[PDB]
Amino acid sequence: ERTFQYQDSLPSLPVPALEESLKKYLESVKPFANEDEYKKTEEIVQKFQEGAGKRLHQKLLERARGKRNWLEEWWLNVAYLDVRIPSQLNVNFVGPCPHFEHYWPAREGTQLERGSMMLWHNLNYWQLLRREKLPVHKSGNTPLDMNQFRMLFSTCKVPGITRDSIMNYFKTESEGHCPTHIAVLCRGRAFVFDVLHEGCLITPPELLRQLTYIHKKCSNEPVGPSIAALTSEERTRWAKAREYLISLDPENLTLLEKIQTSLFVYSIEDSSPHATPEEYSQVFEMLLGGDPSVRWGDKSYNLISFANGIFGCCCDHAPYDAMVMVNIAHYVDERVLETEGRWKGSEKVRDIPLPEELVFTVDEKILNDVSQAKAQHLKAASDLQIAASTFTLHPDTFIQLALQLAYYRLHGRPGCCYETAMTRYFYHGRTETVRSCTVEAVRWCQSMQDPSASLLERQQKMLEAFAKHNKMMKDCSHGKGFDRHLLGLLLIAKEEGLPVPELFEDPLFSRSGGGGNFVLSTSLVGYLRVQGVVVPMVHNGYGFFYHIRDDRFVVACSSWRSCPETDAEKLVQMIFHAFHDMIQLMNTAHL
Template sequence: MYKDMKQISSVKEGPTPSHAVISGKGRIFVFDCLHTDGTLITPQEILIVLQRVRTILDYEPIGDCVPILTHGDRTTWANNYLRLQEISEKNRETIRIIESSSIVIAFDENEPQSYEEISLFCVNGDYHSKWGDRSSTIIAYKNGRFACVGEHSAYDGTISVSYALFVQLSMYETPEPDWSSTDTSKVVALKELKFDLDVELQKEIERTKVECDRRRNDVIVTHDSFNEYGKDVIKTWNLHPDSFVQVIMQLAYAELHKEIASTYETALMRHFYNGRTETLRSCSSEVYKFIQIARESKSSTSEIVTSFRNAVNHHNHMMNEARKGHGVDRHLFGLWCIAHENQIDVAEFFDDPLYIKSGGGGNFILSTSTLGYSTNVGFVAPMTLDGYGVFYTITSDTIYIQITAFRDSIKTSAHKFNETFQRQFLKIKRIMEAVNNSKL
């Protein structure tokens, strides 16, 4: 149905797309970011284009809302995608323009008041205007706040975070333009993209609207920051920041749920050609031993710190092994794919209850990832109904954390997990300082 397409090329390879797409209230517009002479349009000219679109959205009716079809279940959307293309050449060209555009900006009518609301509206905001299969879409909320949402099958999710960071930094580094200065001799053409729709697709649009409204509040998202310390302090303890956070996360889960959890952490394999990711199963025997000691009232601070260091260092070692390609999950997934694609019976191992309980087959209770060392955080929904998504970035003095959970789960609570997580950071800091002070 859908395949990755290379849109960016070198100068020798020929021209690349230079158009941008703006969507809002179920309508889609396109304009070219280059003048006919090949020069870039100016920020002032972009502002005029955005103002023109905003005026249309404010004073004209809602559009046909075709983008909402991309938010249906994948099989249904695949069928609707083919149907759209079959109806007319115009539709095929419209889809090509959307998919190949250099950037997509979606106007969302919501007005979030916090980072948590910004995150929630990424998930349950304006479905009518976001083309779900786009690898990256910048969301502009009505009150001037921004977010970035993307479908990252074609690349590592951390690239979206880096992309947003580069945009952020460029805004800091580039002086604000003189908005009153505009070259009126050059007019940027703006065109609205419209689809040919039959009765069947019109019904599908209405059905998908109902489906999206029903699922609107399925996912709970928290956005918080731990401000007591960050990687600078962690490094003074000679511990790796990511491994440090992962082990504390395991302790937090055990404190809240009185059990351990199968855990997925993304291990990047970018030093391999076309390398993507491997799974680090970070709930190790060393972590389990630490949790037992940390939760035992008779344990001394020295015992807790020793077991904590062992768990953190083991995690760091296993992360390095996973990055070298020594993990098991991608190998097993490859075997499963080969069997499936060649219509060979899949090994019984993949249906074994213990394999599933360990997280196999996309059943990890904790789906986690570190997203680098900036202030930009991202998230996805949990893998399982009674699971969590835990995503974080670590700066010099702060740890930014986003946690997701399903509202229908009677077991999980994203907010309680976040509170417990923060308490464990403080607990470990007190213990580490107590041991260090005793050595003075």
């Protein structure tokens, strides 16, 4: 069995029935509307269903007739590439490598040694992928889309004036040649070297010589021009800075492309985030913040190495979602476990070429832009607050409802929530929105705060909330959600120069979360001991992510300090109490 052999067999992303989508939409706005607003929205939806919507839907069906995935290109552009805000901090997702839970606890002086092994395992993953030896993901006997794995290596975003682009240089052995070098960022400088020698992958001792060489060379020398810091800027500012940089010397483009085509970028940081099984929220913070001078925000996969032997991944969210990163990070975690975090092979170090430095041609203007880039990123990142803890009826639904209750208790109102739903059953399927803030969820939350509510009432309403969320998640992952569908209708109109339908201008459309206005941006990040996180979707909102183990729940929450109303730590404390109360309710109801 080969990694991508089922791709040509995957079913097309479906287009739900208009009526069902509009029914679900109407039901979703109830928690945020009074009688009048609801009646208004209902009439707007009815007219839409009878007129413009019916026509736009037909056009969407025609698009689907010619595309195995009618949403793919649109989603990439509208959700990522066209967005102008600095993506490195506000869009990229990060994930700490869980090796400090066992063999690699935080310890000064272990950066280079552990680093050599981190690269070795990551590269072995790449070899498996290139040979298509990576196991095909399946639900039962049904294969899932594996296309996102092509975006892990040799993939990089390139800034544009109005629209960025994704360059995917990866290729399996059957398709052709694939770049074989990695890029290392250190002290505002950049180096590259081939990972192959005489046909085989170089070993940890050899990789250690490369890293040691780079580290030692830069340590007692001033920080370089830090061109990488430009990747953390507002997208248009970076696009222009990139054009200017290239105008200074054609060769500069060659240097940029070398970074772009590298299997991945490895960053050497001199900071040491507190990272223990108990407290490691700081790893998330330095991963999203850090020193821009050694981070290539546009890279799909930027492996980060801290001074205390701690590691993490920072990824561009544009080409793929977090699960690919979770998979490789877990793969590495297993390798470290099986090897006791050591290289027990030959200590020989063959005579391989030393890393080559990419020396960019720069002038006073470029250096001023670089300076500006670093400053804006550091300032913006300093406003980020991260709270991470471990707590020890589908678990995902349980957590989603607990979050609803926690927010309800902490802020006194239902929080419109976005939960990622994967649609990998379909060709190049990525995600769909699950709206956790349902009428059922709110009714249950009210009963939990209702002194006159009987144990039986609370249990009954909670179960009804579970059932609703479960059905919702199932439909969404099966392509029957409605958020992407409505987006598609909107894009059909725009692409033809037709006006925006009134349904989207309706106050309830954005109050219910539409248009990227969810106060709670959430997602399960799997069951592989790896945790991921991104900043909130809105200034006065939260980012809440988690992963599930057979004996615990691990959560990571983000919020903006400049927003006095929100507090990531308090929300996490609140959800833990929520977990407690729900557990108690279930056990008591047990009887």
